[PDB]
Amino acid sequence: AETVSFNFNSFSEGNPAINFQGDVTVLSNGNIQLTNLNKVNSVGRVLYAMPVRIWSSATGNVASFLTSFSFEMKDIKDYDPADGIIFFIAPEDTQIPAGSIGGGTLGVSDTKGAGHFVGVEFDTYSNSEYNDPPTDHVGIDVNSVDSVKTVPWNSVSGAVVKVTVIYDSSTKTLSVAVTNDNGDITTIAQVVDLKAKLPERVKFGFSASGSLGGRQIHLIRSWSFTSTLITT
Amino acid sequence: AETVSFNFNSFSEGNPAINFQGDVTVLSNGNIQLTNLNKVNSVGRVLYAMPVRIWSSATGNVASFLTSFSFEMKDIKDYDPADGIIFFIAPEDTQIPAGSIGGGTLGVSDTKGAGHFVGVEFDTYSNSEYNDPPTDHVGIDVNSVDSVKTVPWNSVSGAVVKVTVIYDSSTKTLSVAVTNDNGDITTIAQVVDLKAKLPERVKFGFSASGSLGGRQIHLIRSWSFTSTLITT
Amino acid sequence: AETVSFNFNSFSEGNPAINFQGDVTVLSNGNIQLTNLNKVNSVGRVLYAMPVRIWSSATGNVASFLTSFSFEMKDIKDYDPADGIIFFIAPEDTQIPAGSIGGGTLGVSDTKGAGHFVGVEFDTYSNSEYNDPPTDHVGIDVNSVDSVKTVPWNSVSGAVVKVTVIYDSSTKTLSVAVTNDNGDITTIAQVVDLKAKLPERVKFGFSASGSLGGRQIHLIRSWSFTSTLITT
Amino acid sequence: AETVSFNFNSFSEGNPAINFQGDVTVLSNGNIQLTNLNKVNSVGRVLYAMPVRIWSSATGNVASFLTSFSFEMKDIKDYDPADGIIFFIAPEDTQIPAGSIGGGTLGVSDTKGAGHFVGVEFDTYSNSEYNDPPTDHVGIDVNSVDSVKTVPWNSVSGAVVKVTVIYDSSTKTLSVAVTNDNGDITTIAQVVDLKAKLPERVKFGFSASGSLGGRQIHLIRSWSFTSTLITT
Ligand SMILES: OC[C@H]1O[C@@H](O[C@H]2[C@H](O)[C@@H](O)[C@@H](O)O[C@@H]2CO)[C@H](O)[C@@H](O)[C@H]1O
Ligand SMILES: OC[C@H]1O[C@@H](O[C@H]2[C@H](O)[C@@H](O)[C@@H](O)O[C@@H]2CO)[C@H](O)[C@@H](O)[C@H]1O
Ligand SMILES: OC[C@H]1O[C@@H](O[C@H]2[C@H](O)[C@@H](O)[C@@H](O)O[C@@H]2CO)[C@H](O)[C@@H](O)[C@H]1O
Ligand SMILES: OC[C@H]1O[C@@H](O[C@H]2[C@H](O)[C@@H](O)[C@@H](O)O[C@@H]2CO)[C@H](O)[C@@H](O)[C@H]1O
Ligand SMILES: [Ca+2]
Ligand SMILES: [Ca+2]
Ligand SMILES: [Ca+2]
Ligand SMILES: [Ca+2]
Ligand SMILES: [Mn+2]
Ligand SMILES: [Mn+2]
Ligand SMILES: [Mn+2]
Ligand SMILES: [Mn+2]
């Protein structure tokens, strides 16, 4: 089988194994800070530089993957804690949408909320334009920030959140387990045909954004990942 | 919310949080050995002593849970490396089946391979009487060792295996991510309505067994667990 | 290490992790109400259902623990706001003393004030028969409600009180930090050898009581706890 | 009573409430990074700007206090993870020792390891010149980094540690509870006469240092404090 595996307990600007897009910046503590607190409509994204083959066009097999990462979102004086973080999968040539307004687009979609990607969003602001639930939530996104499915969640400022994601190729099931600071877990699963939605080779990464009045600290602390594609 | 969470990096006899059934033994390194290498049809089971309420008859809600554990199976001279380990969920009054023949029953079912439990098996011997695939495998079991679903797997002697399981109550999806020593991951997912198959109060644990000719070292090295039930 | 850890931000009847004894009742808001305002000499106790091994006779080791909890006492019309709440540790077979008169015994001692337990009381009535200080007070109790040591305190009706207790096994020191509604803190420390006073396995819990004329609302709002025993 | 209370969920340079000394720096995420990874023998300290009266020469009373804080230490490529962080109490005019060599001095003692301060150290390097234990450890220091008492500990890279400290004026006991990432707790308590070792007006703060070959990330994430002095 074809396996791609990597582990990051801290990051560094200059590490070729990672693509930095937008306002992303690396702190002296190794944390990746996605958005710039001073910029309006800030958008920052980080992608694993090596594209991953999530499915074979020859066998029709989709890859199974296991990934876990930890992030932290914190409030900053006088700004609404917005808009959130999104773990996404997109075509290998993905870039921040031209003229991105940040905000509820989470840095992965156009103004209508459309884009080419599959991801798990940790949404901390309710955008009625994208049919967001009234509270903070974790959502499964398929080519749109208008979630296919969401579950109520609570974003605690300064809290380190651990997330585990399992994608089972056979069932095409995407399940997420979120471990909040207080020990409680929040889960959400959704069948998503990766081969029908994305190209053979994709890139994995994170993205976050802010608006003029909505800004907060978005940090990726660590990230381990393993994908296995059966080639037979 | 109602959360039960525990983390075992090592075990020690005398700990009231752990119930031992059968040929279980605690090694000095803190590892648990499930079967006795000198006994015919050995069965060993370890359970979290406290019953967990996976669903509420009052709200009809089912709990979501996230658990990861690591184990090791090592061949011993002369015996067939069998029969494996099973991570199961059973009624709180669960006991080793009376007159258990061990072997392919994995210590959780009767001779016909039937019993009251839901589990994830790491089967290393092909029992045709229970329709086992021809190779080592991982399987989702529901009241039977005749798996509802299996996925080809490989048990490497002396290899430390890491497993992560997510049960999403909303979708009733049980997903398993197995990480082999060589970095490759194996996944298997299955929709299982815990509320329909199990009583409100259950116990979680591991069971291993052998036969006269089938014997091998079965080790549980660690186990972390978190279940969250919505009480409103 | 052998660690037992739990966290309760709210409670609900049916959670097997909790044992109720006496007139305990769970409110719709998730709070636990210890006594029944309509019963004479009411006594209500809640205990963590799983026995904890605070010390090993095999190693002579004693565990250290950190626990924090919040409670509230509210006066009711024209009953005496009596008699208080007590956080205690007792043998796992602990039951409300037979023929308990409640009142000043706080639900853990006999009529003479004797019992088998260690605890921290938040006393709101002064029982001369138990040598209570003339005012409300926090006290360290060892097998008796005739506190080994007390510190003046003031129970404010309707006020939420936060408590932090640290037990350092090495020095056998039990220190308590009580944070009042107004912001001030009250502390009390006392060396207590748990190994000498209690058996290896015990239970932690809260007890409250009243009498015929002494009754009030005793509420347990939250409770987090962690103990670690060195097994080596 | 005279009570001083403050709570920081994030810090920032320019906040008059805090004094910065040495190589301290405030990351955009609100975290305080005590040492400079690029400087040899780096020392950074942070203090609550306002001196706190711990004892009174008039009444002879000593204040009790409750304080908890969280920090994080993480390794950096090719540098020994040293030397650690220390929560200290010192005269209101306390300064980084003249000609400090950082390293095992933790930025509070001279070359011989002497200084005017009381503190709890989270020591990650074994300096035999100060009689350190052979492993990472937590220690109570009184005017010397030659801890009056230490307890075995383990500094996990990238893990967020929570510390709770209670000082009971009555028994003059200083007990510390350290909650590790894996949930285990470590405690240490020592009787310390603040009145005899420190002036009436003191300053609380954190200090960390490194050497040429010894460097690591030292972050202070949050800090709440409450001291109450009985003025009668
Ligand atoms: O409050 C945060 C949200 O802001 C929305 O945009 C605001 C913008 O921040 C404000 O300055 C003004 O222009 O009104 C806009 C419309 O609400 C974002 O659209 C939303 O995503 C949040 O970031
Ligand atoms: O070889 C391992 C398998 O043994 C099977 O039982 C054998 C037994 O070991 C042998 O001594 C003889 O009695 O024949 C039995 C039937 O094949 C178990 O049934 C199977 O589960 C494996 O353990
Ligand atoms: O007033 C509260 C105290 O009452 C004492 O008991 C009283 C009882 O309430 C009253 O009805 C009558 O029977 O006299 C008793 C003796 O004083 C309790 O002993 C004390 O603990 C408080 O609850
Ligand atoms: O390795 C960390 C320890 O370093 C010790 O100092 C070293 C110094 O880092 C190195 O450059 C060379 O000069 O040898 C010194 C002697 O060991 C510190 O004394 C110790 O506290 C640690 O930081
Ligand atoms: Ca949104
Ligand atoms: Ca089998
Ligand atoms: Ca009393
Ligand atoms: Ca040192
Ligand atoms: Mn959304
Ligand atoms: Mn099988
Ligand atoms: Mn009393
Ligand atoms: Mn030291």
Question: Please, what is the oligomeric state?
Answer: homotetramer
Order of helices and strands of chain A: EEEEEEEEEEEEEEHEE
The two chains with the largest interface, and their residue counts, are: A-B, 30 and 30 residues
What's the number of domains of chain A? 1
Blueprint of the fold:
The structure is a homotetramer of 232-residue chains.
Chain A: E1 2-8, E2 18-22, E3 25-26, E4 32-33, E5 43-48, E6 52-53, E7 64-74, E8 84-91, E9 114-123, E10 137-144, E11 149-152, E12 159-168, E13 173-179, E14 185-191, H1 194-197, E15 201-209, E16 217-229
Antiparallel strand pairs in A: 1-16, 2-5, 3-4, 4-16, 5-15, 6-15, 7-12, 7-16, 8-9, 8-15, 9-10, 10-11, 12-13, 13-14
One manganese (II) ion (MN) binds at residues 121, 123, 132, 137, 139, 145, 147 of chain A.
Subunit structure (chains A, B, C, D): Homotetramer.
Function (chains A, B, C, D): D-galactose specific lectin.
Binding site for Mn(2+) (chains A, B, C, D): 121, 123, 132, 137
Question: Can you put this structure into words, describing what you see?
Answer:
The structure is a homotetramer of 232-residue chains. With 232 residues, chain A is mostly beta strands. Chain A has a single domain, classed as Jelly Rolls, CATH 2.60.120. Helix content of chain A is 2%, strand content 48%. Chain A has one helix and 16 strands. Chain A has one helix at residues 194-197, and strands spanning 2-8, 18-22, 25-26, 32-33, 43-48, 52-53, 64-74, 84-91, 114-123, 137-144, 149-152, 159-168, 173-179, 185-191, 201-209, 217-229. Chain A starts with a strand and ends with a strand. The interface between A and B is medium-sized, with 30 and 30 residues. The structure holds a molecule of 2 linked components (GLC-GAL) (4 copies), calcium ion (4 copies) and manganese (II) ion (4 copies). The site of one manganese (II) ion (MN) has 6 residues of chain B, from strand 9 and strand 10.
